[PDB]
Amino acid sequence: MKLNISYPVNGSQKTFEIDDEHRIRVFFDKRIGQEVDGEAVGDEFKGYVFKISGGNDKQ
């Protein structure tokens, strides 16, 4: 899936594209508001913490 990432300290935002079930899967069964440590999703986002906020399915 496509990640919608916001940096709300700066008021910035950008999108990112993850293919790779194992890189994604880190987000599975995680709920809105749960935090997710970054490295699992990539090497760029190492250390970065993400609080999930919502988003859209297909359709």
Partner: protein, 608 residues
């Protein structure tokens, strides 16, 4: 009681010579025996005329006609309700018309001769409908009345008042070069003058269409694909509300036709009304919000249906049947071989066929590169890619017509070849030409089904090739290549100028003969479906058009299709009902899932 019925007679003057027959039509008819009016002789033009009012529907006259000049049909009074316009006595008559809508794109699809072209003129204000009657001196007033009960009524009031002047992209593709030179002088001049829109519009429009190279060339000089696109440019550049496109996919390659479709759709965004006619379903689906289907016998009649949805209209089209109308418009349904269906043989023949090494052909302005590939016997290879890629160049080299700059292909084999763009340059008549190539191929039943009976070449036999038509000439050329025996046959772009039924007749033709005869064939194509049916392997071409290009070795159907479709980035999931390609939009989850699977198309095969 019984349902209601009618008789309609249409006679082709080309087919009729009263001298040889005598005015036999009048003599044989039973109504005239009694002293009735059904057939009246017109001393002037010296043609037989059949009145629909007095005719019995006997069909006696049809059988007696020595040629096959007369046609009488019996309809349930389906046609009578809808009458829009008629060309003249015993000629083509049009029924219904397509709705226009602002801010959207309305499609039209049908077989040739349906009046899709005619319909555009009527909407354009170019021609005034007679209403199957006298209406001639500008009687736009009567047309609104005829249209009442239809959404077109509002449009006709608008047209008469001339508040809106529609812009038309002319249909006949062959005719255009003669009409314009320069536009006056060179395509560039046309684009500067017409550009009512943004200065950005000149640059932007050219970039998206891939017109950059073509600007300096003159219109007459243009190749078919290039010729089409300049017309499209002018139809964006113009300032107006209504933009009519009539057959914008013609001559274009696979990459380009998709590009044209997107740009045309942009008009809907400015909320400008768009209308379009298409022979291609891939293109039609993308463009349209609403779709009309035009059906009926060619040159006899053609009715437009009520407006439908994009998905819905396409689905009904492929069935070959329409329920309200209750007509089976197409005699046989279209089907594609599963690949389970094909015969299973060990193929090699003499161990494999001939092979070609790396080849290069460089004009000095364009360079073609070819990768060594192998060909085997009794196989079929599709060639795909955009024009200007050297798809044409490659085939020529194998034909021996062109000499490679580097590489060599001297084969022992006898080759038959069919050229891509067909322009007549042979003196002689059609029958003479085909008989020289081979008689006996003309005797076969296969050839009766596909060529002779559908078109009626018998009538064409005397006609000159210069005098001929585009699509008719195309089927004849394809057949001629097959006329003579050869180890390998080469065909280049058989789909040009042909409608749905016509192309599909060709698809059956190449596959069946090749299988049977155990010979090989190379076919170049833009049409997705045609490639699928015929081939076992494919070569995909890539690179940049009008610059350089590259070719690949032959690879399996699944493998080759993934590569080609990956370049386009449109997936054609599968529709469960139709088994048709169903297009997939960009960034998506369902489409995204496929990208990870490597499936651009689906068929009756295993796969997720």
């Amino acid at each position: 009681m019984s349902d209601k019925n009618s008789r309609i007679a249409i006679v082709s003057a080309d087919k009729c010579k009263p001298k040889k027959c005598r005015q036999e039509c009048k003599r044989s008819c039973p109504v005239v025996k009694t002293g009735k009016l059904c057939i009246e002789v017109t001393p002037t033009s010296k043609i037989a005329f059949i009145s629909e009012i007095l005719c019995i529907g006997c069909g006696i006259c049809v059988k007696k006609c020595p040629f096959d000049a007369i046609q009488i049909i019996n309809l349930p009074t389906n046609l009578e309700a809808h009458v829009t316009h008629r060309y003249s006595a015993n000629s083509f008559k049009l029924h219904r018309l397509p709705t226009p809508r602002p801010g959207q794109v309305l499609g039209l699809v049908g077989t040739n001769g349906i009046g899709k072209s005619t319909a555009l003129k009527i909407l354009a204000g170019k021609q005034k409908p007679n209403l199957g009657r006298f209406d001639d001196p500008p009687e736009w007033q009567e047309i609104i009345k005829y249209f009442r009960g239809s959404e077109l009524q509002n449009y006709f009031t608008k047209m008469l008042e001339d508040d809106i002047k529609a812009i038309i992209k002319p249909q006949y593709v062959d005719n255009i070069p003669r009409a314009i030179k320069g536009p006056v002088q060179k395509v560039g001049e046309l684009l500067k003058l017409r550009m009512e829109k943004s200065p950005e519009d000149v640059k932007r429009y050219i970039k998206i269409l891939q017109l950059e190279n073509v600007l300096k060339r003159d219109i007459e000089k243009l190749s078919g694909g290039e010729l089409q696109r300049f017309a499209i440019g002018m139809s964006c550049v113009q300032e107006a509300d209504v933009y009519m496109f009539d057959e914008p996919s013609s001559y274009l390659d696979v990459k380009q036709r998709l590009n044209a479709a997107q740009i045309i759709r942009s008009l809907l965004a400015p909320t400008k009304y768009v209308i379009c006619v298409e022979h291609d379903l891939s293109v039609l689906d993308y463009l349209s919000d609403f779709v009309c289907i035009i059906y009926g016998v060619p040159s006899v009649y053609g009715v437009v249906t009520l407006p439908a949805s994009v998905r819905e209209g396409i689905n009904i089209f492929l069935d070959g049947h329409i329920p309200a109308e209750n007509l089976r418009f197409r005699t046989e349904a279209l089907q594609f071989r599963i690949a389970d269906a094909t015969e299973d043989l060990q193929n090699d023949s003499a161990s494999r066929a001939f092979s070609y090494p790396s080849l290069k052909k460089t004009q000095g302005d364009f360079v073609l590169n070819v990768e060594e590939g192998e060909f085997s016997d009794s196989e079929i290879l599709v060639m795909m890619g955009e024009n200007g890629t050297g798809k044409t160049t490659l085939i020529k080299l194998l034909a021996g017509a062109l000499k490679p700059d580097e590489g060599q292909d001297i084969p022992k084999l006898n080759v038959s070849m069919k050229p891509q763009k067909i322009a007549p340059k042979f003196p002689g008549t059609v029958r003479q030409l085909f008989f020289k190539k081979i008689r006996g191929q003309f005797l076969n039943p296969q050839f009766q089904t596909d060529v002779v009976k559908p078109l009626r070449i018998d009538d064409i036999i005397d006609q000159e090739v210069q005098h001929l038509s585009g699509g008719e000439l195309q089927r004849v050329a394809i057949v001629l290549a097959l006329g003579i025996p050869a180890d390998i046959y080469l065909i280049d772009e058989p789909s040009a100028y042909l409608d749905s039924e016509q192309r599909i007749i060709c698809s059956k033709v190449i596959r069946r003969f090749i299988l049977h005869n155990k010979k090989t064939a190379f076919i170049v194509e833009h049409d997705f479906i045609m490639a699928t049916y015929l081939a076992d392997k494919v070569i995909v071409f890539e690179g940049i058009p009008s610059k350089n290009a590259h070719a690949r070795a032959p690879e399996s159907l699944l493998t080759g299709c993934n590569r080609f479709l990956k370049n386009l980035n449109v997936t054609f999931r599968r529709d469960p009902n139709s088994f048709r390609p169903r297009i997939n939009k960009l960034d998506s989850q369902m489409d995204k899932e496929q990208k990870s699977s490597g499936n651009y198309f689906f068929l009756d095969n295993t796969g997720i």
